[PDB]
Design a protein around this ligand. Structure first.
Ligand SMILES: Nc1nc2c(ncn2[C@@H]2O[C@H](COP(=O)(O)OP(=O)(O)OP(=O)(O)O)[C@@H](O)[C@H]2O)c(=O)[nH]1
Ligand SMILES: O=C(O)C(=O)CS(=O)(=O)O
Ligand SMILES: [Mn+2]
Ligand SMILES: [Mn+2]
Ligand SMILES: [Mn+2]
Ligand code: NA
Length: 612
């Protein structure tokens, strides 16, 4: 009799599964947080189809989702307009020393992370979590990041009061009983989440979407293997396996253990000769990873296949190959801009078993968003994401710009045969890229590994303004300076077969703000060039910024009107500005934690530019 009364025994409140079936430390995790959060019910997720349909029915009954009648088992959730995206300002990492998490900025304001003390977090935690799940179900999500059972997979337990989180996590991860069995008495990442709206409600509910914007806080405690998230039900704030776990926690572990957790798509590309290579590409959010990951190549005889569109875990094998796996189980893709033109393969994926968030609904029960490129029949009407009637004449979009689809990976018609291989896929090329409207040509190749890493460090998003090194600005699990040092150390691994490093720019514009490159499926012409360069073809011309394609090295047939002078042009004047800017940025944001080799590469680039 380990108790004097009932104890912390929550058995009486279990409505799915059994606490007795849980590994000991898992049970402890549940009951400790049950005591803190005070849920009315505990639901231990098994991951079955039966559970999933019952969950969707419950949410349908609760008014939390709408069935999209035009498609097969597709659903729509509409959110509070205050809870529409992963929120960087409320995202923090707790460590003993600030500098372990983020370099100390000379300006006194860091773009590379957001550190919170243990003391401050404890106060914030205590002001948020006690009784937060009152009147709600605590769902227990046992999930594997990476192929189930594999020793490279990592397991988490997410406790959440959101059924929307459960349904999405079932798509985005491998979840259920088999995960608990794979876990045994092993280590797991502790993931705690609440929408922060205990019953009875204190503030009004908008669009049946529970959230607490004012108290929204997404915290990480890597030393405790803990992710603790409050107040948002949206994407990266709530699906804790994705950014919180597979990037922030995992990059820190990767640093300690000799691997890599990165914001990268993984694709397999096959040339007309049937030769296949795998490539990894880091672009910032909103810069087109998912379009490339799922590309339909315009060039005949070329094939692209998707391993993953968002997150990559990578490490060397015994033979020196950099091996990559997608730790996700689905795609959580931006809906607006998705079309037959921009992503035909996504269009084919998302018509069954898919959850949409903040897109518009058509009167015949279908989905709509800006950039969909499909006219509707006259008479068909649109309900916006704000649940109002909508006309193309309105002063606002029918879908939120960050509206999403959530879709099973295995459903993708071009999903790669090896997308679940526990040994991972051999990466032969790493592609960096972002939005650079000026100065940066379509593609270049790095001069060396060290130059490659410098190229990643100098990536940009948002109109070529915001620095987003390695597409990881909001995702570093630790000090950026040390992350660079970790990337640089890869060149010292004996027999390491280092991938070639490229930088792309789909976004160069002319003087009128017109895109100089067609992009999307046409980016196959760029990947072809990369493929050949990996094969060691004599197709490259040396410049101050790296190797670029020679004249006529790129297949431009079918695009005879491309302004090649402007697209591939390199200006001494522009690049002088570029180095000066990178210098100020690294001085301000990285300073004492900058590895010497990065300083050297900045000097080397400046040097080559001075000889123009
Ligand atoms: N001009 C141009 N735009 C592109 C191309 N590929 C993608 N885009 C744009 O990039 C945006 C879509 O990419 P997203 O799905 O938002 O980016 P992502 O990297 O998948 O972002 P997350 O899913 O948030 O990580 C849209 O604005 C597209 O128009 C291209 O080849 N050319
Ligand atoms: O912002 C991103 O990079 C995303 O992939 C969406 S979310 O998972 O952070 O919501
Ligand atoms: Mn009810
Ligand atoms: Mn994406
Ligand atoms: Mn992303
Ligand atoms: Na809703």
């Amino acid at each position: 009799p380990p108790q004097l009364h009932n104890g912390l025994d929550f058995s009486a409140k279990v409505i799915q599964g059994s606490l007795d079936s849980l590994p000991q430390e898992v049970r402890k995790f549940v009951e400790g947080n049950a005591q803190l959060c005070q849920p009315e019910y505990i639901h231990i997720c098994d991951g079955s189809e039966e559970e999933y349909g019952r969950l969707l029915a419950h949410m349908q009954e609760e008014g939390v989702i709408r069935k999209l009648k035009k498609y097969d088992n597709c659903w729509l959730a509409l959110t509070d307009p205050r809870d529409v995206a992963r929120i960087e300002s409320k995202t923090v990492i707790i460590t003993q020393e600030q500098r372990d998490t983020v370099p100390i900025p000379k300006s006194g304001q860091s773009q590379l992370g957001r550190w919170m003390s243990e003391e401050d977090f404890e106060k914030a935690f205590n002001a948020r979590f006690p009784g937060c799940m009152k009147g709600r179900t605590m769902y227990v999500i046992p999930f594997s990041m990476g192929p189930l059972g594999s020793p490279l997979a990592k397991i988490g337990i997410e406790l959440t009061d959101s059924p929307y989180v459960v349904a999405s996590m079932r798509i985005m991860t491998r979840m259920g009983t088999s995960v608990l069995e794979a876990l045994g008495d092993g280590e797991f990442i502790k993931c705690l989440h609440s929408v922060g709206c205990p019953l009875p409600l204190k503030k009004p509910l908008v669009n049946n979407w529970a959230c607490n914007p004012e108290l929204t806080l997404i915290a990480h405690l890597p030393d405790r293997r803990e992710i603790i998230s409050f107040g948002s039900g949206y994407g990266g704030n709530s699906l804790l396996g994705k950014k919180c776990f597979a990037l922030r926690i995992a990059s820190r572990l990767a640093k300690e253990e000799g691997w890599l957790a990165e914001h990268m798509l993984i694709l397999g590309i096959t040339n007309p000769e049937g030769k296949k290579k795998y490539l990894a590409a880091a672009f910032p959010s909103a810069c087109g990873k998912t379009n490339l990951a799922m590309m339909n190549p315009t060039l005949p005889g070329w094939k692209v296949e998707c391993v993953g569109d968002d997150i990559a875990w990578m490490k060397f094998d015994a033979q020196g190959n950099l091996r990559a796996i997608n730790p996700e189980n689905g795609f959580f893709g931006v809906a607006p801009g998705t079309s037959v033109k921009t992503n035909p393969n996504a269009i084919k994926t998302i018509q069954k078993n898919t959850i949409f968030t903040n897109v518009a609904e058509t009167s015949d029960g279908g989905v709509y968003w800006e950039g969909i490129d499909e006219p509707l029949a006259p008479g068909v009407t649109i309900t916006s994401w704000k649940n109002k009637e909508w006309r193309p004449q309105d002063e606002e979009p029918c879908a939120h710009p960050n509206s999403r689809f959530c879709t099973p990976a295995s459903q993708c018609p071009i999903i790669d045969p090896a997308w679940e291989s526990p040994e991972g896929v051999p990466i032969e090329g790493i592609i960096f890229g972002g939005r650079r409207p000026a100065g940066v040509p379509l593609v270049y190749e790095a001069l060396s590994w060290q130059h490659g890493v410098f190229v990643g460090a100098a990536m940009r998003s948002e109109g070529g303004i915001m620095h987003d090194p390695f597409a990881m600005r909001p995702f570093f699990g630790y000090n950026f300076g040390k992350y660079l040092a970790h990337w640089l150390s890869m060149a010292h691994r004996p027999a390491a077969k280092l991938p070639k490093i490229f930088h792309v720019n789909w976004f160069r514009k002319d003087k009128n703000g017109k895109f100089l490159w067609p992009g999307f499926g046409e980016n196959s012409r760029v990947l072809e060039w990369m493929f050949g360069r990996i094969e060691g073809e004599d197709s490259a011309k040396l410049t101050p910024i790296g190797y670029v394609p020679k004249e006529d090295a790129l297949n431009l047939k079918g695009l005879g009107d491309v302004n090649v002078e402007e697209l591939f042009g390199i200006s001494k004047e522009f690049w002088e500005k570029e180095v000066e800017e990178i210098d100020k940025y690294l001085e301000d944001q990285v300073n004492a934690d900058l590895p010497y080799e990065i300083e050297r590469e900045l000097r080397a680039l400046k040097q080559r530019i001075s000889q123009m």
